[PDB]
Design a protein around this ligand. Structure first.
Ligand SMILES: CC(=O)N[C@@H]1[C@@H](O)[C@H](O)[C@@H](CO)O[C@H]1O
Ligand SMILES: CC(=O)N[C@@H]1[C@@H](O)[C@H](O)[C@@H](CO)O[C@H]1O
Ligand SMILES: [Cl-]
Ligand SMILES: [Cl-]
Ligand SMILES: [Cl-]
Ligand SMILES: [Cl-]
Lengths: 337, 343
């Protein structure tokens, strides 16, 4: 079986019959996990194993950014800094900040891999303008050159554990005021202004950027469609001008800005997303699985398969004794308050 | 399948030719062998090279296979589709025009370098050179990225990221820095008379700053007269007190080639001195019979931790075969960027 375009979630800490039905659907390609899916490492590892047992080619993801966005924060998961802390470190010592960013990435990925997770939806490449509450301390820095090199160093750490990455929220959520969870944010800047600054990290990262999530933000001088439903943003700019060949994941179609779910999914995929997220309503996601309009998918499937974690990973009982992991832990503890 | 229970030994040696002989097979099965380094004489074409690396792994399942693919003046395989890579100095020149572009190009170069080697069954390249470009060292020359250790660090880091995208590790060299000394360690014993603080401030800084982005190190056969009378690869002060100790380095340490004239400061004694000082593996190049004397004479017993470090140098994950690689969009993007950005 090959991955479908929909990433959805499961009902709880153990798989149900209804989850198994959805996981077997040809239009399912992923699972996203939240805090409610985590009781402890043993339970989470059993859950991810059970998911892969139903659907061998499934991608399993989570939001592990650090700071305010980190689903698993107990039973030995390391509580990671807000990414803003790394930009503050850079302002004091550029080179140390890059070293610490790698150590954070390695820890982040290695601990996720130990529980059988493929990837985290990180890094946030949004610029820290100070304008956006929803982003806030999730942004690395104001300066796109600094965002790029800190995010690159983080992504390097992720790669040391065989993990990919996903830059977000393209072409930039940092400037717009509103929260896309609960409203429809707008950004009235010119295309050239957005390209010069906010898009620059996506371009400069090159092969170091594996995937993107687009913002549910309307860039009113560029397209009246939100970026994840915009052929202009996803094809003309990201695939075209930037030459990007990695996976594109819609932002959560359950979010107010994304406003049927099936129509929004079809529109996201037509615009250029390879996978669509439907979070926190699995029955409604099942309606999407069965209602989605047919489309060419071979090019999307190549990209989706390339988001699976690479190589072997250490289980927890080995990771806890690994010198690299221990060195990374010591550096985090000493370099950051 | 390997019928015999073995663990990798400390010696990295070479084979006699383009196909394995009986005598190579004997050396590859010796308990003290842990790796093979390939040179230009081992390369006729990709098909032959891939068969040779496969044949090496079949004799010794846990063997590490390495090559010097730096780019520029140091690149063993340059034909039958291998991409001729720039001298690392070119990346530092690009940095001086456009820092961010340089970092993007460095990753592209790393990815091409590693992916091509993976397609032919090689684990790793002995790159990056972290030596600083003082303009003093002919043996280093355009192999150095840049004068400034901060620039060397970030370009090398970006290169190593590219290597990691293809599942390949890396090896920083030649620690604590070959760029300041004049002499060529292939034919002479170079000296460097700077204070420890001066050497730590600049030349060692990339090793410290790279952190986990640095997988391994080759020490220089250079005497740093203010720090230790022993060349760095035979110095417990350099390897234990500075590298393992001060810097907390946990990766593999490979001696520089013990066949070099500087290493004469016998082969077996030199290997034992290198391993005692802190090397996990020793290189013995271009004299397989002499390497075999070392195999049978070596006193060192490898620790479990050296074995772990050596095993972690093996390439990770699945690699694309050549015909798939050259049609891959990401490889094609990397090639296009090299062609445009370095013109
Ligand atoms: C602007 C924003 O925060 N969007 C988030 C995104 O970061 C996250 O990856 C996704 C999946 O949980 O959910 C969205 O709400
Ligand atoms: C100073 C110098 O160039 N040393 C080289 C080293 O870079 C190379 O990796 C090794 C194995 O071929 O041989 C040494 O001669
Ligand atoms: Cl577990
Ligand atoms: Cl690229
Ligand atoms: Cl570290
Ligand atoms: Cl591919």
């Amino acid at each position: 079986t090959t991955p479908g375009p929909v990433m959805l979630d499961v009902v709880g800490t153990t798989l149900s019959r209804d989850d198994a039905r959805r996981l077997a659907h040809p239009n399912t390609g992923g699972v996203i996990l939240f805090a409610r899916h985590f009781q402890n490492r043993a339970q989470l590892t059993a859950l991810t194993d059970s998911i892969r047992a139903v659907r061998e080619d499934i991608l399993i993801a989570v939001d592990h950014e650090g700071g305010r966005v980190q689903r698993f924060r107990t039973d030995g998961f390391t509580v990671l800094p807000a990414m803003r802390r790394l930009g503050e470190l850079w302002d004091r010592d550029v080179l140390l900040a890059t070293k610490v960013a790698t150590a954070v990435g390695y820890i982040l990925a290695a601990e996720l891999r130990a529980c059988g997770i493929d990837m985290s939806f990180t890094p946030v490449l949004d610029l820290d303008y100070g304008h956006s509450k929803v982003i806030g301390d999730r942004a690395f820095h104001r300066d796109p050159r600094v965002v790029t090199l800190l995010a690159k160093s983080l992504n390097h750490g992720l790669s040391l554990a065989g993990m990919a990455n996903c830059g977000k929220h393209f072409p930039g959520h940092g400037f717009a005021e509103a929260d896309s969870h609960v409203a429809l944010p707008t950004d009235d800047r010119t295309l050239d202004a957005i390209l010069e600054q906010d898009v620059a990290p996506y371009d400069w990262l090159g092969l170091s950027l594996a995937a993107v999530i687009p913002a549910h933000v309307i860039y009113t001088q560029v397209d009246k469609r939100p970026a994840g439903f915009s052929r202009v943003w996803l094809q003309d700019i990201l695939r075209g001008k930037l030459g990007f060949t990695g996976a594109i994941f819609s932002d959560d179609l359950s979010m107010e800005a994304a406003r049927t779910l099936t129509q929004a999914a079809d529109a996201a995929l037509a615009a250029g997303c390879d996978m669509v997220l439907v979070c926190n309503q699995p029955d409604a996601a099942e309606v999407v699985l069965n209602g989605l309009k047919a489309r060419a998918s071979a090019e999307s499937v190549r990209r989706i398969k390339r988001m699976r974690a690479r190589g072997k990973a250490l289980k927890w009982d080995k990771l806890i004794a690994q010198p690299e992991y221990l060195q990374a832990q010591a550096l985090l503890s000493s370099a950051l308050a």
